[PDB]
Ligand binder design. Sequence first.
Ligand code: A1AIL
Length: 472
Amino acid sequence: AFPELLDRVGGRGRFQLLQAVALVTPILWVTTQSMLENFSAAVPHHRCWVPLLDNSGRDVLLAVSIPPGPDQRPHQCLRFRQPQWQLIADTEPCEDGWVYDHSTFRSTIVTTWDLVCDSQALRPMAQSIFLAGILVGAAVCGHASDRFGRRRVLTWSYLLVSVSGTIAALMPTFPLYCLFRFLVASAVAGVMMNTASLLMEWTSAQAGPLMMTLNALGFSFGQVLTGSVAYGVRSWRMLQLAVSAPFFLFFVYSWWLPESARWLITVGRLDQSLRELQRVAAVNRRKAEADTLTVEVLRSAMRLRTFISMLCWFAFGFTFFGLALDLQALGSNIFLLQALIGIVDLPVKMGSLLLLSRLGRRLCQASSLVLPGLCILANILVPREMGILRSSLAVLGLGSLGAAFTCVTIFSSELFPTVIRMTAVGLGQVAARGGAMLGPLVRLLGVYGSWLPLLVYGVVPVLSGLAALLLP
Ligand SMILES: O=C(O)CSc1nnc(Br)n1-c1ccc(C2CC2)c2ccccc12
């Protein structure tokens, strides 16, 4: 009887739009917390400290103390025991600290904790930890909202994000920074899950698509904000503070939004449900049918396809969250990137969807994985002088993976007995959040050659997409 009550109280109108506006400004700043590791953990050019240079012909002094490296650069991990003045065999690891290049970034976490050379694996692990935190928090919060309400959990998760972010920028050692970020990730996962549930709960008939696409396009405008606030704030201790502070301001105003009116009925909190419904009626201005509500009415109210879908989400997480958290290897000008991604994404997603869906439902699913995977794979062959070509195939490569998110959120999930779709979209997101933890771990394989990470990162989407043609 709840849909009839919702029709009696509103639908579309004013409040159902104010609520949407009030819970999407925070989803731009959840994508400034996830992809900040391209600007707060960026490896600059690091050389070895020398007593000759850098105080107790600059070019000759640099050439005599540091042996030449393989990639046409001074060595980043070794120095000469004694100035080899024979240069008009014996090398010792750096023992006086590195010297970094401060020309685009002032202080990253790499600069402050020396996560270079031998201690290199720790950098692709500080992201897998965060994704594991998101995975854990998206599973714990599921069993903590059906008993504590759907609005209180969001309000407290805002405060948790704010406090954990404001604390994580003031730690003196790596292990604690790898734990407070875990807490931030769990709270962020809770925020996203509850925002989606609240967005759908209050809306009927006009929500099947529109509502769950508004969360996914808040991410695309969020990237453009990461680029901008990093063009501006350049340090790393003043970036986490500036990103985590707005969540406290969101927490204060989050005390006025009404709670879900469908959860209040199944628990017996009829009186407050009535208060919430009448309050919503006044904002919606449809104060004509609301006189009907007199407690009693609310008292009466109180396999192959499945496997194909999971593989598709796994491939989005593995490839996107591994190749996008190192946009320093897909080209240059990191600030210009992370902003063209969303601007490409929205026109690309809309235009690709409109044209391809007319071919068929399976064709759109197939062409949204093989195309970006092949675009990424065809990036190795390009020589490192057509930057427009190497960067363009990267921008368009990563942007087109963002249309797989949409073409498997609404257009798909019908490939089942078709009762209701909130059965398997949930199980799909478990895979995508678990392929992201098994994500940047592939980037640990930069040794044994450097082409292999990109090769795997392009092959996996291609095989996953080509397996979708085997539906029967
Ligand atoms: O929880 C989920 O949404 C399922 S996978 C996941 N886990 N953490 C995050 Br953030 N994401 C994310 C899932 C999907 C997107 C699509 C391209 C627009 C994201 C874009 C930017 C940052 C994170 C994203």
